[PDB]
UniProtKB/Swiss-Prot annotation, chain A:
UniProt protein name: Photosystem I chlorophyll a/b-binding protein 6, chloroplastic
Record text on cofactor binding: Binds at least 14 chlorophylls (8 Chl-a and 6 Chl-b) and carotenoids such as lutein and neoxanthin.
Binding site for chlorophyll b 1: W14
Keyword Calcium included in the entry's annotation: no
Residues annotated as binding chlorophyll b 2: R58
Phenotype reported upon loss of the gene: Slightly lower NDH activity in immature leaves. No chlorophyll fluorescence increase in mature leaves. Smaller version of the NAD(P)H dehydrogenase-photosystem I supercomplex (NDH-PSI) supercomplex. In the double mutant lhca5 lhca6, drastic reduction of NDH subunits accumulation upon increased light intensity.
Binding, chlorophyll b 4: R114
Residues that, per the record, bind chlorophyll a 5: K167, Q185
Record keyword Chloroplast present: yes
Gene: LHCA6
Membrane topology: Multi-pass membrane protein
Organism: Arabidopsis thaliana
Quaternary data: The LHC complex consists of chlorophyll a-b binding proteins. Homodimer. Binds pigments. Element of the NAD(P)H dehydrogenase-photosystem I supercomplex (NDH-PSI).
Membrane-crossing segments per the record: 92-110, 174-190
From Swiss-Prot, chain C:
Keywords recorded for this protein, A-Z: Chloroplast, Membrane, Photosynthesis, Photosystem I, Plastid, Thylakoid, Transmembrane, Transmembrane helix
Name of the featured protein: Photosystem I reaction center subunit IX
Segments passing through the bilayer: 7-27
Species name: Arabidopsis thaliana
Function according to Swiss-Prot or TrEMBL: May help in the organization of the PsaE and PsaF subunits.
Highest taxon of source: Eukaryota
Protein topology in the membrane: Single-pass membrane protein
UniProt signal peptide: none
GO annotation, biological process: photosynthesis
Gene3D superfamilies: Single helix bin
From Swiss-Prot, chain D:
Single biological process term from Gene Ontology: photosynthesis
Segments passing through the bilayer: 2-22, 40-60
Record lineage: Eukaryota, Viridiplantae, Streptophyta, Embryophyta, Tracheophyta
Entry GO CC: chloroplast; chloroplast thylakoid; chloroplast thylakoid membrane; nucleus; photosystem I; thylakoid
UniProt topology in membrane: Multi-pass membrane protein
Record's subcellular location: Plastid, Chloroplast thylakoid membrane
Keyword Transmembrane helix included in the entry's annotation: yes
Protein's UniProt name: Photosystem I reaction center subunit psaK, chloroplastic
Principal location: plastid
The species this protein was found in: Arabidopsis thaliana (Mouse-ear cress)
Swiss-Prot record, chain E:
Phenotype for N51F: Reduced chlorophyll-b content in pigment complex
Protein name: Photosystem I chlorophyll a/b-binding protein 3-1, chloroplastic
Entry-annotated residues carrying Phosphoserine: S143
Organism: Arabidopsis thaliana (Mouse-ear cress)
GO cellular component annotations of the record: chloroplast; chloroplast thylakoid; chloroplast thylakoid membrane; nucleus; photosystem I; plastoglobule; thylakoid
Length: 212, 314, 42, 65, 219
């Protein structure tokens, strides 16, 4: 039920007809053999890179959400003067430098607990114990937990665990690329992402990157 | 006969030999007993005749090493053209090439070294260069930093090309000794093709780019309102007004009526009085004649057919 | 990447990385605090 | 060009005389139907050399005479 | 057995095993001993076939907008030569529904999906029928030869069920393709030497063949 079964060797690859490398057997989610350079050779380092991909993708997903959804609300008439690449320069309280150090303190606690999970899995355990009940030992990056799996979707309730982790990773790789598009086309157009979408959808031919 | 004579994948591309240092020999691929090991590592680093005692592996190594050197030279050229593009007073030097010091290097103002940026002239504070690259660029009729920038990108392209070529000609598809040992073909190609067609194409550049633009600059023209070289190629009326010999075309050439081509291929000896260099008409005629010479010279040695000479036979 | 971290662990690659970082540090300090001849911060 | 002129005559005759000197004369794989050798490479060679002689003589005639 | 400028070494690997084996390898490109990279006797056959096919499309798609345009059948706006269509912006430019660089990205993406598959079929032929490419990989699997895949998608009709007809059709293919490659070379050199279309060159040579090729390097 909850085993994290891998993908088969005859799985879809990033490049059909190509040989997948031997260090991408399929144990990780979203394994399509993408390794033209082979940065995940050492498996002790490929674990760290899988955790890197997972956290990078989760942050990129929350970020693309926090960029496009609030812009949809601005178009609906909820938020004023919204522009994500100028939303750090605009005014708040706490000067944006007290906010930074408070952020570093709180995220240092959080990401330090996550780091202690990465170095040694059982150190910072949560989901407190109960009498005559066994909380299952989780994996790194997928802690389960009362705080991060309160709907119990991680152990494989609606779908298997491998396909759900692959959903996370694929949706999140797409979000990572979406945020790269945000960081690039908000500086080479000096405009809004949703505005750029509607502008390309107006005339897809001539409203492309080559106009600028 | 002179075949292609290469083999596929002789050496596996990997960083395993990046890890173990001094892999290339017997007495260095053990580890440092002393600190002499490091010096003997660097000393015997390119001593390919000591690593492997066969001319095949040696020749592959030096061939790909020459490719690395060519990548380095192209990278250095890209650097010089780029520093002439974005970090230079090349326009101000073109406007007044007698009181503006050629400068294509600017230092960063950090520890007082900013005083090395001198009053070279042209509203520019930098180091007066001495490579004569500005003079080459006026001999080529550049007249714009866009052209220097794009040939810098082209030289970076060629550096990547030479690096990939060295990787390909060592690790993926490397020649064997039957390819290097044939030298009649190497000489024929390096004469007719490298030095022959090289001088031919440089004479083409000069005939089509350097001569008109330098005649305009000598007549007195702001390099901004000077016509581009492709305007000289396309707009025939323009280059024909510069040299009416172009108005007839290549029927001067193919009917051997070259006497009318003596408006832009002169034998005018001596120096150009207006600019102190040589006459670029003379230089275009030079590279053309050198092209004919090396092209007939590169058909001297016998490579694959019956005609030619054997260097052994000579 | 296996055996690239061993190459980057080698003495010249590691020395150029350390001294590039260190030289950038000193360079940016001298940009921030140029022309220093005393330590007045106590 | 301008077939029949001097520049055409003393070039055609140079090219054909070099082809002859390579064919039946002292000058010198690729199996052609020709009776005795004179492959495509030899043909192009004699044509190139005859054009060399032709350019030389037409321009020595245009320099003087 | 018909040999066009065959040599002593060219009759060592061009025996009969390729469509169009007229033994014409004087330079010695497709010599099987000592090969690698792209100078291979199989890759060069594939390259002949592919450049010939693309050259056939080029030849009967570059003079087609002028074969028609000087006879009606299309607007004169969409009747440019092969080089005044935006492919030589110095020489000419047509304005399509997209700019030429968006169309280049289109060409690159669509041909990438079309030809990286072809390449991976060159490397391992069994592939291109094992990954879910919207189910149309059922026809992209059958390869046999790499240059002559012959599936439901590329060879819907038989046209060479028997090996005699298939050999004759392969010969016709490579010969029309060599003719089309020489034609494309003629297109490039004629547009370079005259600056007008190839059909204009044909009509000028046919009608009153004066200054047929005497206009050397003159526009
Ligand atoms: C991780 C990134 C990633 C990269 C770099 C590629 C690279 C490629 N895939 Mg792809 N894939 C990638 C993710 C995936 N692919 C696939 C499944 C496939 C299939 C089934 C096919 C490809 C093909 C391609 C090619 C299409 C590119 C093109 O047409 O021109 C790109 C055009 C430009 C860049 C424009 C430039 C100007 C290219 C080699 C096709 C192919 O090989 O042919 C093909 O059939 N991929 C899956 C599902 C498992 C992926 C998962 O993330
Ligand atoms: C934070 C970035 C990041 C990281 C660390 C990883 C890490 C990993 N990926 Mg994932 N991936 C990512 C982003 C990332 N990915 C994105 C954005 C995509 C979509 C484009 C993918 C698509 C993908 C597929 C399809 C597959 C993987 C796989 C893998 C594994 C092997 C590759 C490896 O070790 O690379 C380590 C990578 C890095 C250390 C990051 C690279 C950093 C260098 C400096 C280059 C960055 C510049 C980049 C080229 C700029 C983009 C330019 C733009 C024009 C596109 C590993 C777990 C394979 C696997 O088994 O899945 C689990 C697999 O099949 N990835
Ligand atoms: C010298 C005293 C000292 C120091 C320097 C630290 C330093 C740290 N502790 Mg520790 N800790 C201490 C005493 C100390 N602790 C004591 C006395 C206890 C009680 C036993 C704890 C219990 C504790 C827990 C339970 C956790 C930390 C965590 C952390 C990290 C917080 C990350 C950050 O910068 O957030 C701003 C940091 C490395 C967190 C962490 O990231 O752990 C790796 C965490 O979860 N500490
Ligand atoms: C849409 C992308 C996506 C998907 C499919 C998943 C999928 C998964 N996550 Mg991940 N996750 C994501 C985004 C995503 N996550 C992001 C952005 C974060 C950062 C906040 C996390 C943080 C996170 C943690 C910390 C944990 C998981 C866990 C899980 C698993 C159970 C929960 C579930 O099914 O989510 C379903 C998701 C949705 C239905 C998306 C809609 C939610 C809206 C926006 C509200 C499953 C593998 C848990 C796990 O694997 O336990 C074993 C676990 O511990 N994820
Ligand atoms: C086409 C040019 C060319 C080529 C291909 C070679 C190739 C070779 N030479 Mg020859 N050589 C050349 C030019 C060339 N050399 C010239 C111009 C000289 C005269 C100085 C020599 C003198 C020479 C001697 C005397 C010896 C060789 C040796 C060798 C071999 C090994 C070299 C090695 O591993 O050192 C690898 C590279 C180095 C150790 C780096 C050298 C560092 C230089 C000297 C410092 C100068 C750099 C710079 C200008 C100063 C500022 C630096 C800055 C950072 C402060 C190799 C076959 C050796 C050999 O075959 O012996 C068996 C040998 O003993 N060469
Ligand atoms: C990243 C791609 C790559 C990889 C992984 C390899 C891997 C390998 N190569 Mg190949 N090679 C490559 C690219 C690559 N090569 C390229 C691009 C070229 C063309 C130059 C070659 C040419 C080549 C030859 C000719 C040989 C190898 C050999 C080797 C093996 C030994 C490597 C070693 O110890 O040297 C590691 C050395 C370095 C990292 C030094 C880099 C030197 C660069 C090219 C010049 C930099 C000079 C710099 C600008 C000037 C100094 C400035 C300084 C003073 C500040 C190994 C399998 C050898 C082999 O297998 O034979 C036994 C061998 O003989 N390689
Ligand atoms: C007419 C064709 C031709 C041309 C132009 C050259 C040119 C060159 N050869 Mg030679 N070579 C040829 C035929 C040719 N070769 C043949 C037939 C053989 C086999 C007998 C060799 C064997 C040979 C050896 C063994 C070596 C060279 C080297 C060199 C380079 C010397 C450096 C120099 O002068 O830099 C001037 C620089 C340039 C003109 C820039 C070069 C840019 C272009 C792209 C490459 C020249 C065309 C080239 C032949 C590649 C053709 C296309 C390729 C995809 C197949 C020079 C680029 C030496 C070298 O540098 O090693 C790399 C070297 O070691 N060649
Ligand atoms: C050995 C002889 C010698 C001496 C004593 C000095 C001394 C000095 N030189 Mg001269 N110099 C020398 C040789 C020497 N130099 C040589 C050989 C050259 C040619 C290469 C130069 C070229 C040169 C230039 C061109 C310049 C100097 C400058 C300076 C000054 C440095 C100011 C600076 O940036 O430091 C600031 C301090 C640091 C960079 C150290 C920071 C270290 C880090 C941050 C760690 C410290 C914190 C640590 C954690 C401990 C905290 C305690 C606790 C909380 C843990 C200083 C008076 C500069 C100047 O101001 O002119 C007077 C200047 O512009 N020098
Ligand atoms: C292969 C190939 C390629 C790359 C092209 C490319 C092109 N053709 Mg050509 N064409 C081809 C084959 C090809 N054709 C064949 C086989 C026939 C028959 C034609 C007949 C044809 C006509 C009649 C016209 C084009 C036109 C065009 C252009 C517009 C295409 C478009 O609107 O979509 C473009 C340059 C049009 C143009 O000139 O613009 C146009 O009027 N083509
Ligand atoms: C692929 C190809 C052409 C493809 C063309 C296309 C797609 C054209 C498209 C367009 O036109 C249209 C439709 C419409 C226009 O508006 C736009 C463009 C874009 C312009 C040509 C290959 C063209 C290839 C050519 C010309 C190759 C010639 C090779 C020769 C002569 C080799 C000879 C030898 O190799 C042998 C036989 C034996 C050796 O031993 C000796 C030697 C002598 C070396």
């Amino acid at each position: 039920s909850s085993v994290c079964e891998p993908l088969p060797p005859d799985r879809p690859l990033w490049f059909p007809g190509s040989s997948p490398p031997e260090w991408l057997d399929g144990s990780l989610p979203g394994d399509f053999g993408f390794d033209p350079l082979g940065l995940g050779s050492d498996p002790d380092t490929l674990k760290w890179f899988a955790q890197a991909e997972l956290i990078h993708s989760r942050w990129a997903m929350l970020a693309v959400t926090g960029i496009i959804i609030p812009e949809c609300l601005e178009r609906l008439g909820f938020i004023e003067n919204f522009s994500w690449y100028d939303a750090g320069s605009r005014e708040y309280f706490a000067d944006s430098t007290t906010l930074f150090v408070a952020q570093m303190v709180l995220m240092g606690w959080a990401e330090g607990r996550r780091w202690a999970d990465l170095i040694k899995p059982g150190s910072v355990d949560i989901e407190p114990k109960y009498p005559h009940k066994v909380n299952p030992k989780p994996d790194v990056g997928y802690p389960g937990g009362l705080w991060f799996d309160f709907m119990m979707w991680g152990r494989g309730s609606p779908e298997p665990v491998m396909v759900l982790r692959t959903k996370e990773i694929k949706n999140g790789r797409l979000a990572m690329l979406a945020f790269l598009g945000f960081c690039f086309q908000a500086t080479y157009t000096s405009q809004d992402p949703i505005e750029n979408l509607m502008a390309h959808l107006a005339d897809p031919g001539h409203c492309n990157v080559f106009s600028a | 006969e002179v075949k292609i004579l290469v083999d596929r994948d002789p050496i596996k591309t990997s960083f395993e030999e990046w890890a173990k240092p001094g892999h290339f020999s017997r007495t260095i691929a053990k580890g440092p007993d002393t600190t002499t090991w490091i010096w003997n590592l660097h000393a015997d680093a390119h001593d390919f005749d000591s690593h492997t005692s066969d001319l095949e592996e040696i020749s592959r190594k030096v061939f790909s090493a020459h490719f690395g050197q060519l990548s380095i030279i192209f990278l250095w050229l890209s650097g010089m053209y780029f520093h002439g593009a974005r970090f230079s007073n090349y326009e101000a030097w073109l406007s007044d090439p007698t009181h503006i010091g050629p400068s294509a290097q600017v230092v960063w103002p950090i520890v007082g070294q900013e005083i090395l940026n001198g009053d070279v002239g042209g509203g520019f504070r930098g180091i007066q260069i001495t490579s004569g690259f500005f003079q080459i660029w006026r001999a080529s009729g550049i007249t714009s930093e866009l052209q220097l920038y794009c040939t810098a990108i082209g030289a970076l392209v060629f550096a990547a090309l030479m690096l990939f070529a060295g990787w390909f000609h060592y690790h993926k598809a490397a020649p064997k000794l039957a390819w290097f040992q044939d030298v009649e073909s190497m000489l024929n190609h390096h004469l007719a093709g490298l030095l022959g067609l090289g001088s031919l194409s440089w004479a083409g550049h000069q005939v089509h780019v350097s001569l008109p633009i330098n005649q305009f600059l000598n007549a007195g023209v702001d390099p901004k309102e000077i016509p581009l070289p492709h305007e000289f190629i396309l707009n025939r009326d323009l280059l024909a007004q510069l040299y009416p010999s172009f108005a007839e075309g290549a029927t001067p050439f193919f009917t051997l009526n070259w006497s009318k081509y003596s408006e832009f291929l002169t034998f005018r000896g001596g120096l150009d009085p207006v600019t102190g260099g040589l006459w670029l008409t003379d230089i275009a005629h030079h590279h053309l004649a050198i092209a004919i010479l090396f092209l007939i010279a590169g058909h001297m040695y016998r490579t694959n057919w019956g005609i030619g000479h054997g260097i052994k036979d000579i | 990447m296996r055996d690239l971290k061993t190459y980057l662990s080698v003495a010249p690659v590691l020395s150029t990385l350390w001294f590039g970082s260190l030289a950038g540090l000193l360079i940016e300090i001298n940009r921030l605090f140029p022309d220093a001849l005393t330590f007045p911060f106590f | 060009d301008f077939i029949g002129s001097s520049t055409n005559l003393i070039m055609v005759t140079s090219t054909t005389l070099m082809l002859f000197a390579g064919r039946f004369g002292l000058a010198p794989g690729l199996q052609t139907g020709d009776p005795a050798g004179f492959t495509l490479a030899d043909t192009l060679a004699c044509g190139t050399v005859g054009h060399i002689i032709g350019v030389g003589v037409v321009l020595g005639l245009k320099n003087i005479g | 057995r018909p040999l066009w400028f065959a040599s002593s070494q060219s009759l060592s690997y061009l025996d009969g095993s390729l469509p169009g084996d007229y033994g014409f390898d004087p330079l010695g490109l497709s010599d099987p001993e000592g090969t690698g990279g792209f100078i291979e006797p199989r890759w060069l056959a594939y390259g002949e076939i592919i450049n010939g096919r693309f050259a056939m499309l080029g030849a009967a798609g570059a003079i087609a907008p002028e074969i028609l345009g000087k006879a009606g059948l299309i607007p004169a706006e969409t009747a440019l030569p092969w080089f005044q269509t935006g492919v030589i912006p110095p020489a000419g430019t047509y304005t399509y529904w997209a700019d030429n660089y968006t169309l280049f990205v289109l060409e690159m993406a669509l041909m990438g999906f079309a030809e990286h598959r072809r390449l991976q079929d060159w490397y391992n032929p069994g592939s291109m029928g094992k990954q879910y490419f919207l189910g149309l990989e059922k026809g992209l699997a059958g390869s046999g030869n790499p240059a002559y895949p012959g599936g439901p998608f590329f060879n819907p009709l038989g046209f060479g069920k028997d090996e005699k007809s298939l050999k004759e059709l392969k010969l016709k293919e490579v010969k029309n393709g060599r003719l089309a490659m020489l034609a494309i070379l003629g297109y490039f050199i004629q547009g370079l030497v005259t600056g007008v279309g190839p059909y204009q060159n044909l009509l000028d040579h046919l009608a009153d063949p004066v200054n047929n090729n005497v206009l050397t390097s003159l526009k």
